[PDB]
Amino acid sequence: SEYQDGKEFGIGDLVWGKIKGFSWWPAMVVSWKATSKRQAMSGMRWVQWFGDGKFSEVSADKLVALGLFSQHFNLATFNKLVSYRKAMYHALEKARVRAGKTFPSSLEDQLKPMLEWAHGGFKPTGIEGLKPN
Amino acid sequence: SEYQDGKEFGIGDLVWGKIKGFSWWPAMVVSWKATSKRQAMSGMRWVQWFGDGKFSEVSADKLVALGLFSQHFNLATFNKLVSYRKAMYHALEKARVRAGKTFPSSLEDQLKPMLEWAHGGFKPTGIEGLKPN
Numbered sequence A, B: 001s002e003y004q005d006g007k008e009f010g011i012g013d014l015v016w017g018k019i020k021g022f023s024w025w026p027a028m029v030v031s032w033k034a035t036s037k038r039q040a041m042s043g044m045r046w047v048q049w050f051g052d053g054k055f056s057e058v059s060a061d062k063l064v065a066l067g068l069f070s071q072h073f074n075l076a077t078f079n080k081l082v083s084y085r086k087a088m089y090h091a092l093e094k095a096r097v098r099a100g101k102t103f104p105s106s107l108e109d110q111l112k113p114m115l116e117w118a119h120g121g122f123k124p125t126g127i128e129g130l131k132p133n
């Protein structure tokens, strides 16, 4: 099947992806069939970016697990860009549901406990709870 | 292991491949396990074409290193087919990263300095920077 190149990351994985000129941005690894383009080159993954829904073919070496959060979250970009805050909401919402996490009940106000959870290490599940399926 | 048949080219090598009826087209040697098809016959190599991401089993004797660039690049095809130009973009991008090369910030316009880097022997690394890993 897809992505059998001995590199990390499979379909459904929540990741940070790094494109030249941009901060690390959250994304989900997808099958090339979802992209309406072409099969990824060996060593690459198609990802779909949270916040804008676009697809990019990105080297596996330029991806890391979303669970390595406090290590790749860019606070300057977050303060500066509303699109980045939006991306984080959609990414962490996906993470939350997967981990079976719940928060008590505005964007910045919805984000706040989600960021704390993420930044704190995604407790109680830890990064294991972010896996697909 | 795979592709130990005494012939040239191993996994990850960037190459030109020639299929009957076509100009030389850029590709990367992959393991058969990436293809989701059969293992390659003796003397053959699975390649994945840049641009469309498809797989072909090609004789190892009908492949040449991407590094022999201007000899095999086909200017006429390039000007004629947008697919070829796209193929060149992806191939050179992969070459660029492996090399550690970088280009200051459209397709052709991004292609322009990449083609010139290639036609002029991939300086400063030369073709040694094109190797996998």
Ligand SMILES: CC(C)CCC[C@H](C)NC(C)C
Pocket: A017, A018, A019, A022, A023, A025, A049, A051, A052, A054, A083
């Ligand atoms: C325009 C805004 C939504 C920010 C751009 C996000 C881009 C698509 N992700 C980059 C990592 C390539």
Ligand SMILES: CC(C)CCC[C@H](C)NC(C)C
Pocket: B017, B018, B019, B022, B023, B025, B049, B051, B052, B054, B056, B081, B083, B084
């Ligand atoms: C996209 C198309 C115009 C051609 C792309 C390369 C294919 C696979 N032909 C090669 C065998 C030379």
